[PDB]
Amino acid sequence: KRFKKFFKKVKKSVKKRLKKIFKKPMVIGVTIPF
């Protein structure tokens, strides 16, 4: 089980990707990248 360590790492990287998925008007605390 060596990939197990990678999973915990992906949580950090992917965490940034979700930022694009939570670009809805409902979410709070998000400013347009200008």
From Swiss-Prot:
It is found in: Secreted; Target cell membrane. Expressed by the venom gland. Potent antimicrobial peptide against Gram-negative (P.aeruginosa, K.pneumoniae, E.coli, A.baumannii). Shows moderate activities against Gram-positive bacteria (E.faecalis, S.aureus, S.pyogenes). Also shows antifungal activity against standard and clinical isolates of yeasts (MIC=10-40 uM) and dermatophytes (MIC=1-5 uM). Adopts an amphipathic alpha helical conformation, that may allow to partition into the target membrane. Shows high toxicity towards human fibroblasts (micromolar ranges). Shows low hemolytic activities on human erythrocytes. Belongs to the cathelicidin family. The putative mature sequence has been predicted by AMPA, a predictive algorithm for identification of peptide stretches with antimicrobial properties. This is Crotalicidin. It comes from Crotalus durissus terrificus (South American rattlesnake). The lineage of its organism: Eukaryota, Metazoa, Chordata, Craniata, Vertebrata. The chain holds residues 161 to 194 of 194 of the full protein.
